[PDB]
Ligand binder design. Structure first.
Ligand SMILES: [Zn+2]
Ligand SMILES: [Zn+2]
Length: 75
């Protein structure tokens, strides 16, 4: 019975996501990325898309997307 293999998980190419996703399920509200750009002011790394701002280089790359859409299977 053990079985679990797929082949429709497209890799997202949206800043902030870079995660996989399903096309047959993908929706305008299933992908959370940042339509803006990475900014660094006062040691506060963020994006010109949202108001989110963090000083931890780690958090910056974690900042969940502020926008919603369909995962980009293309760069
Ligand atoms: Zn954002
Ligand atoms: Zn995505």
């Amino acid at each position: 019975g053990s079985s679990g293999s797929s082949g429709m998980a497209l890799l997202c190419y949206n800043r902030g996501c870079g995660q996989r996703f399903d096309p047959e399920t993908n929706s305008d509200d299933a992908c959370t990325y940042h339509p803006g750009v990475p900014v660094f002011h006062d040691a506060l790394k963020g994006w010109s898309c949202c108001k989110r701002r963090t000083t931890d280089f780690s958090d910056f790359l974690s900042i969940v997307g502020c926008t919603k859409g369909r995962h980009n299977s293309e760069k």
